[PDB]
Amino acid sequence: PKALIVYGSTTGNTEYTAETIARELADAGYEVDSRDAASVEAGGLFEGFDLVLLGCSTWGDDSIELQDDFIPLFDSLEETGAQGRKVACFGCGESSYEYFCGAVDAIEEKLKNLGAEIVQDGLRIDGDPRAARDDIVGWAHDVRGAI
Ligand SMILES: Cc1cc2nc3c(=O)[nH]c(=O)nc-3n(C[C@H](O)[C@H](O)[C@H](O)COP(=O)(O)O)c2cc1C
C-alpha cells in the first residue's frame, strides 16, 4: 500500500516521531511518502493513499494552538480528500499544559467530522519522543494491523 505521513514539528520531536513511524510502515512493505506540513498543499493532498498519518505538536496555552506549519493544512482539511480515508493522528507535547496534545484532538475531531475513518486513537507523546520509541513503534504496528 501507499501511506502518506505529514507533520508539523518545530523542535523536531514530532518529525522524529514521524520518521520512526515512516520506518516501521516501510519495513512492513508500504511505500511511505513523508512530508513536512510546511511543504504541502491541502487541495487533493490525500488523493491516492490507502493510509494517511497526520502529525502535529501543540503550542498555545489557554486554548488549543497548533504548530504554525500545520495551520493552513488544518484550515483546509475539507479539501484534502479525507472522506472515507483511513486516517490516524499523532503528536508530541507536555502533560502540564491544560490541553495535553490538544492539536491531536483538534485534528482527529475535524477529521471525524469530514467523514474519515480514524483507524486508531491518536498517539500523544509527552516529553522526549526518543524516550518513548517503543510506544511510537508499537502504535505504528497497531495502525498497520487495523487497516
Ligand atoms: C509556549 C508553549 C506552549 C506549549 N503548549 C503545549 C500544549 O498547550 N499542550 C501540549 O501537550 N504541549 C505544549 N507544549 C509542549 C510542546 O509542544 C513540546 O515541546 C512538544 O514536544 C514539542 O514537540 P515537537 O519537537 O515535535 O515540535 C508547549 C510548549 C511551549 C513553548
From Swiss-Prot:
InterPro entries: Flav_short (IPR010087), Flavdoxin-like (IPR001094), Flavodoxin (IPR050619), Flavodoxin/NO_synth (IPR008254), Flavodoxin_CS (IPR001226), Flavoprotein-like_sf (IPR029039)
UniProt family annotation: Belongs to the flavodoxin family.
GO-annotated molecular function: electron transfer activity; FMN binding
Cofactor annotation: FMN
PANTHER family, per the entry: FLAVODOXIN 1, FLAVODOXIN 2
Name of protein: Flavodoxin
Coiled-coil intervals, chain numbering: none
NCBIfam families the record matches: flav_short
Domain Flavodoxin-like: 3-144
Function: Low-potential electron donor to a number of redox enzymes.
Cystine pairs: none
SUPFAM superfamilies in the record: Flavoproteins
Record-linked Pfam families: Flavodoxin_1
Key words of the record: Electron transport, Flavoprotein, FMN, Transport
